[PDB]
Amino acid sequence: GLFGAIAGFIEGGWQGMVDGWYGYHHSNEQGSGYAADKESTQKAIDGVTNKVNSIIDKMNTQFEAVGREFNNLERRIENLNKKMEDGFLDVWTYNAELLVLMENERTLDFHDSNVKNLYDKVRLQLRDNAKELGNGCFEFYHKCDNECMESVRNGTYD
Amino acid sequence: GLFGAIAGFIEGGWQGMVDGWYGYHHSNEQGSGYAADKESTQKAIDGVTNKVNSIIDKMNTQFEAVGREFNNLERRIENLNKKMEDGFLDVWTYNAELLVLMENERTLDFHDSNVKNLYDKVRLQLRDNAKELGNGCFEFYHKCDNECMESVRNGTYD
Amino acid sequence: GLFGAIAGFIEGGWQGMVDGWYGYHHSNEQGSGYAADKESTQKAIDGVTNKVNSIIDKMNTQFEAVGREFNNLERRIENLNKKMEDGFLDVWTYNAELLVLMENERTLDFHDSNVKNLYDKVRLQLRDNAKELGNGCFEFYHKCDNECMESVRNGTYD
Amino acid sequence: DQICIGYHANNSTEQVDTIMEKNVTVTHAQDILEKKHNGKLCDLDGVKPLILRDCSVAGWLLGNPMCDEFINVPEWSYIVEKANPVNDLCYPGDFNDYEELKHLLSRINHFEKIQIIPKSSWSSHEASLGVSSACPYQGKSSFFRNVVWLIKKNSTYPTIKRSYNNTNQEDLLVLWGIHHPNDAAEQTKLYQNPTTYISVGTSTLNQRLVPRIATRSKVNGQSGRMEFFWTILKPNDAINFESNGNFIAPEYAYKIVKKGDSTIMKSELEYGNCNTKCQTPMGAINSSMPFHNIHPLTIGECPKYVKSNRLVLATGLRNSP
Amino acid sequence: DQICIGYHANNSTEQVDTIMEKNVTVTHAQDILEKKHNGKLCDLDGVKPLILRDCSVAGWLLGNPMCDEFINVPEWSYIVEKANPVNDLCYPGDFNDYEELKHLLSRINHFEKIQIIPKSSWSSHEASLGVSSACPYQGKSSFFRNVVWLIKKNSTYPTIKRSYNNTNQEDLLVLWGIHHPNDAAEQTKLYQNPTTYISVGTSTLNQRLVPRIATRSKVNGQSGRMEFFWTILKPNDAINFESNGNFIAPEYAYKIVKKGDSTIMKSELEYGNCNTKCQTPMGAINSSMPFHNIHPLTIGECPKYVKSNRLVLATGLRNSP
Amino acid sequence: DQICIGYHANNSTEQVDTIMEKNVTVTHAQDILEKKHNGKLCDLDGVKPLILRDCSVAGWLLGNPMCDEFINVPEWSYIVEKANPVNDLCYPGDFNDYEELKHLLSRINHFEKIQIIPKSSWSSHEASLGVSSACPYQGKSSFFRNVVWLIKKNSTYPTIKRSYNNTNQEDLLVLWGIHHPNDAAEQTKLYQNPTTYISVGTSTLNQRLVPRIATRSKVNGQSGRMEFFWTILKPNDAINFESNGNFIAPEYAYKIVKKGDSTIMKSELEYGNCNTKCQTPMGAINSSMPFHNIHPLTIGECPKYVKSNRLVLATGLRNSP
């Protein structure tokens, strides 16, 4: 994807993180586990929810086919009616399919963006304090307990 | 936004920078102030100006309703005329509203992109010479006077 | 462009790299030359190929003008027919021109993205091992022969 | 000691399309296209459709003897007619401005039939003998129940001068007809007078019909033809008939009880004994989706129709193997 | 010592919509939708509209006695007619192919009325007594000024054989009519001859009209009817009338002075004493915006109509609190 | 020692447009709009078009004497007619429901002409003398080859009673006409009987035509008029003619050999001696592009028409100077 994180430098997702879309894995003497970043997850939920509604409502005004009948000597006007009703249904089918296509691409990229921003944010705190492993992970120079770890998660590290 | 800068790691804009969209704040013994980066501002002005024109002109060919009258026994053809004229006006209303919607999102992201690129560029010059504070700012290891500061702004630092 | 690489911090392309869209230039005691990164080039080829096909096929269902004739006292219905056929051709002309416009912008940005990701990936391997020059290039602290160089290209450096 | 940034995967199998890539597996998705219907014709918001079945709109309105199921019909939500209903125009002919009438019907939910000119009211003309073998009822030669096939009495057909004035508040659909016979001798046999006319007049109408004699093929075993005409009689307006033969006089006319908002959908289906909020000619739609792909022609609170086979939005992110 | 990268904020209150977020406050924006009009009917590029007011296109062209304001009209930019103009077809009837004529008018800016057959030219028929109480002028029974209600002279109506040939360069709109009386006795009273016809012929036209007697409701206190017909007479072509009664003869016909590019807009408004470059049935548009939402039907250099309430483009960036 | 990341440049000159920037030079591009055609009228998939040239559809079907090139035509792929063909309706008049017929023709590839009522079959009427100077052939007064201008024999025109029944499997296009003379004396001169009719009947048709006498301009040196009518005779149906004058009887009628899928394109061009898979009124299209901008009206495997001057997709990246 466009932002290099999702299935880029972060090779794959985490089956074990269940309470959010993005977050952290920590690993130390005391143990290991997953913590969802609530902030960015919530921002992402809002973004995607609004989008779906925007997509739906922008499509609520569409063409409605209406039944019209014509006799045996009104073939031209019957054909006209057919090609007009079909013409609009094709325009709207195209509009709908394309909007879904383009916005799916933008949604996937949005998630990628959210992962890269969260990563960069953690990278900006750690500074020279940890080795940037190159796979989404940072390896600490100093021992880092749970409350040290908690510190990284809430943006209060240093 | 997509690029993490605007209302991301740079928490908010500057009321005090008036002569441009993006630039610098410097702070030293001699004082402090704002300098607009003219280059990126100008590139952004061109981008947005062209866009607006592109948007306008791509819409200059649209459907034009024309008045047609029908007698009491031409109800079907009158209905056909109504649904055709209304059908096109809905297609174009949708086209217009969506284009504005999608491009507004792309404009906001464009500005975000321009801020991130300018930031990264300054980050690439400073190297290990200054501490990356994590909020858009860099704190110099050495004292940095106005002409040292001027140096960073024109890409001639080192 | 959006991702800062193409005609950003990498000032221009390479006439001398012929076998791919993105890759490496190396320079050492043994010599110098260009090696295409096959992986990202191939991913880009697939992306752009699928896009073109998607664009084409999403346009295969369009309005088809049909010839209809009207006598001297059927002027309204003739006008209706003209404005309907012209109306659809304008809708589709707009759809086509806009899709090309928007997707051209997304293609250029895609390439920019691919260049930035490849750059960042190499930056993540080198770590503190080389000076980040700020123009797409990294200058090694240690001497780096061809097989050391080969090492950087296949992601096996350290 | 290590901290990592990462993202959600799951066992999701849902796939979405993008411009550059098809079948991207995503953690979460939302289908927005309704692909299902029940396949029945149902009541629309409790209100039952007028299902003609075999009868056509012409057969119904004129009162085809085989169309007795519909002598008096409750208000409907929508109308259903087959592509080729057997019971139409039993006695061969034409229905003038038929389609413009059907168009008018699509904006009407209730007709109320009232008598305008009684059969008993015909002194100088025979009104009991205007029947045909092309329109049978229970094995005997009958005729369109809402009009009257008038015939000469004791070898005389005096000029008819008849007038009805719409006292009702409601608009009135008035039907009448003209008989086109086979030859000169049949004109004499039925109407006595050799050359005839039917003049019809309202505040707007200015009509005069003349019988067209021609030799033609038998349709329903009859070579004669009936041509039916109609008008909408405004409140306080009167309709004036004058004729010396070939007149198919109004007996009943339909009160325009109410508007509006119905359709005449073409369907081979029968009543389904169900209820819906959105009906198609193929079946009913019950769903909260914004789109559907069932049929273009719907009635009720309906999703927007599209010709897609699949509309799925990504909500979550690219699921990893 | 510190250097920072940053971006512009201001006191801007303008908001724009995106797909993922509504009401984003931005530093700069551009509204592209014109929401305002003045509410008047104005001259279009100096050129005044033909404002019929109470008169209809029929009332105007035929020369309704109450439509004297428009006996001779300057070239117009566009036409304005009310939804239900009182002064139409004063003497009840129909105007044949009325809408196809109105359609033709939408491509005409100037008519020039010229006399084709003078009133004084009628030797064997009375031409001064073809008037009615349905069309009054200054309290006295008058008639459509552009045609002639011809009547018998000394109990005889000889066959009319009249011919006009378009010597003019310009196409010619020729109007004529036929009177449909109430009964046999009125036919005699006015025209003497019991059965009549009007045959009209040009290079293309091949017409023969026959009066339709019927009993009908009084409209404007009259039960007789007039049916009006028209043609466009090509240059160098001749029009040939032959009639033995019920003829409403042309007196004046309109020269087709020029084309083209006008409309017949429906509006209850009166003249506004203003000037514009773009006119709608609701009022005039003066703006440099690419879009407007006033009314679909415009004339002139106009922005593109859309049904939006709001179209605002972001130009600057997300303004911060 | 140095390693660098970089991207491809080349000598490419191709340019693409985006929303924010026009004429971006790119390394690779793909044009998707076909701008070229050959400028000829060609066979469509081997199958030759019916090129009328000077003749019109009316002139062809009726059998205008100057339209002999098309007495019998092979099946066509599509039809080509000029904007104003000289050889149409040689004897002046009208063709009733002409456009609805042309519409029907656009769904027909093969007509097969068969004789229904022979010239030799006319005992009591003259069938050799129904000719005119308005329709000449080789310098002599001729007439539409597919119909018969019937005239009185020894000062009598007996009632014609003629019937043809469609034994063929295939639908049958039956043409006939009526002569409208100049005056009372010409009616006598040609047909003897003063007042006449033509009654036409099938299972659906119920027609009676009456000659319209009028004085009118000479078109092609003749002031008389012919009005032509048509029907499609269903298999097993019969058509019944009855007339006492002014009858233009069928001689030949066209078998509806096949459907379907053709067009009647308007073009001033002549046959090009070429072959194509996609034809326009301006010339043929041979290309693998998804779009073209040649002409809206095409026939065959065609790219989608757009009004663009240029459609170019970027495939490679921004080329650097």
Q: Which of residues 10-69 of C touch F (CB under 8 A)?
A: 10-15, 17-18, 20-29, 34, 48, 52, 55-56, 59-60, 62, 64-69
- A55 to E19: CB separation less than 8 angstroms, yes or no: yes
CB count within 10 Å of CB A101 equals 19
φ/ψ (deg, to 5) at F274: -135, 175
Helix extents (H) in chain E = 57-62, 98-105, 184-191
Helix extents (H) in chain D = 57-62, 98-105, 184-191
**Strand positions, DSSP E, B37-120:** none
Rounded to 5°, the CA angle E165-E166-E171 comes to 150
Describe the crossing of helices D98-105 and B75-126 by its angle, rounded to 10 degrees: 60
Q: What is the DSSP letter of F318?
A: B
Q: What is the DSSP letter of E54?
A: T
User: Are the beta carbons of F227 and F180 closer than 8 angstroms?
Assistant: yes
Q: How many structural domains does chain C have?
A: 1
Q: Which two tokens stand for residue D269?
A: 């289906």
Question: Which of C39, C51, C63, C64 is the mutation pick for testing A, counting most A CBs within 10 A?
Answer: C63
C87 touching E (Cβ < 8 Å): no
B71 touching D (Cβ < 8 Å): no
Residue D299 burial class via C-beta count within 10 angstroms: exposed 0-12, middle 13-18, buried 19 and up: buried
Rounded to 5°, the CA angle E121-E127-E133 comes to 150
Distance between CA atoms of residues A95 and A111, nearest Å = 24
| Strand duo F29-31 + F312-314: pairing | antiparallel
Distance between CA atoms of residues E218 and E216, nearest Å = 7
Buried b (16+ CB within 10 A) or exposed e, F80-104: bbbeebebbbbbbbbbebbbbbbbb
User: Are the beta carbons of F146 and F186 closer than 8 angstroms?
Assistant: no
Per CB-CB distance under 8 Å, the chain A contacts of F103 are: 75-76, 79
User: Are the beta carbons of E150 and E198 closer than 8 angstroms?
Assistant: no
Q: Which two tokens stand for residue F195?
A: 């007042």
From F97, F107, F98, select the one nearest F60 (Cα to Cα). Answer: F98
Which residues lie across from D243 on neighbouring strands? D160, D198
Per CB-CB distance under 8 Å, the chain A contacts of C77 are: 77, 80
Q: What is the DSSP string of D144-191?
A: -TTEEE-EEBTTB-PPEEEEEE--SSS-EEEEEEEEE-SSHHHHHHHH
Q: What is the DSSP string of E193-261?
A: -SS--EEEE-SS-EEEE---------BTTB--EEEEEEEEEPTT-EEEEEESSSEEEESEEEEEEE---
C87 touching B (Cβ < 8 Å): yes
End-to-end CA distance of chain C: 32
Neighbours of chain B (3+ CB pairs under 8 A): A, C, D, E, F
Distance between CA atoms of residues D156 and D151, nearest Å = 9
Distance between CA atoms of residues D116 and D240, nearest Å = 12
How far apart are the CA of F318 and the nearest CA of chain C, in angstroms?
Answer: 7
Distance between CA atoms of residues B139 and B133, nearest Å = 7
Which residues lie across from E173 on neighbouring strands? E232, E254
C109 touching A (Cβ < 8 Å): yes
The technique by which this structure was obtained is: X-ray
Tell me which residue has tokens 């009887």: F249
User: Are the beta carbons of A119 and D5 closer than 8 angstroms?
Assistant: yes
Q: What is the CATH number of the domain that holds C94?
A: 3.90.20.10
Rounded to 5°, the CA angle D280-D284-D290 comes to 85
User: Are the beta carbons of F232 and F103 closer than 8 angstroms?
Assistant: no
Distance between CA atoms of residues E188 and E168, nearest Å = 39
User: Are the beta carbons of F254 and F10 closer than 8 angstroms?
Assistant: no
Which residues lie across from F275 on neighbouring strands? F43
User: Are the beta carbons of F249 and F116 closer than 8 angstroms?
Assistant: no
SS3 A60: coil
Element (H, E) at E165: strand E160-165
Distance between CA atoms of residues D181 and D194, nearest Å = 11
Q: What dihedral do alpha carbons B125, B126, B129, B131 form, nearest 10°?
A: -160
Distance between CA atoms of residues A107 and A99, nearest Å = 12
Per CB-CB distance under 8 Å, the chain D contacts of A140 are: 1-3
Distance between CA atoms of residues A76 and A74, nearest Å = 6
Distance between CA atoms of residues B47 and F19, nearest Å = 8
User: Are the beta carbons of C98 and A125 closer than 8 angstroms?
Assistant: no
Neighbours of chain E (3+ CB pairs under 8 A): A, B, C, D, F
Per CB-CB distance under 8 Å, the chain B contacts of F307 are: 61
SS3 D311: coil
How far apart are the CA of A117 and the nearest CA of chain B, in angstroms?
Answer: 6
- B66 to C76: CB separation less than 8 angstroms, yes or no: no
φ/ψ (deg, to 5) at D279: -120, 135
Rounded to 5°, the CA angle A81-A87-A89 comes to 105
Q: Which domain does B113 fall in, by range? A: 1-158
From D152, D50, D141, D148, select the one nearest D90 (Cα to Cα). Answer: D141
User: Are the beta carbons of E172 and E233 closer than 8 angstroms?
Assistant: yes
Sign, CA dihedral D232-D238-D242-D246, equals positive
Distance between CA atoms of residues F33 and E5, nearest Å = 45
Q: How many CA atoms lie within 13 A of C107 on its CB side?
A: 33
Q: Which two tokens stand for residue F204?
A: 């659906």
Per CB-CB distance under 8 Å, the chain C contacts of B54 are: 101
Query: What resolution (Å)?
Result: 2.5
Residues 6+ apart with CB under 8 A from A129: A140, A141, A142, A157, A158
How far apart are the CA of C78 and the nearest CA of chain E, in angstroms?
Answer: 11
Q: Which domains does chain F have, with CATH numbers?
A: 1-47+270-321 (2.10.77.10), 48-269 (3.90.209.20)
Q: Which two tokens stand for residue D273?
A: 């004994």
Tell me which residue has tokens 């129909």: E94
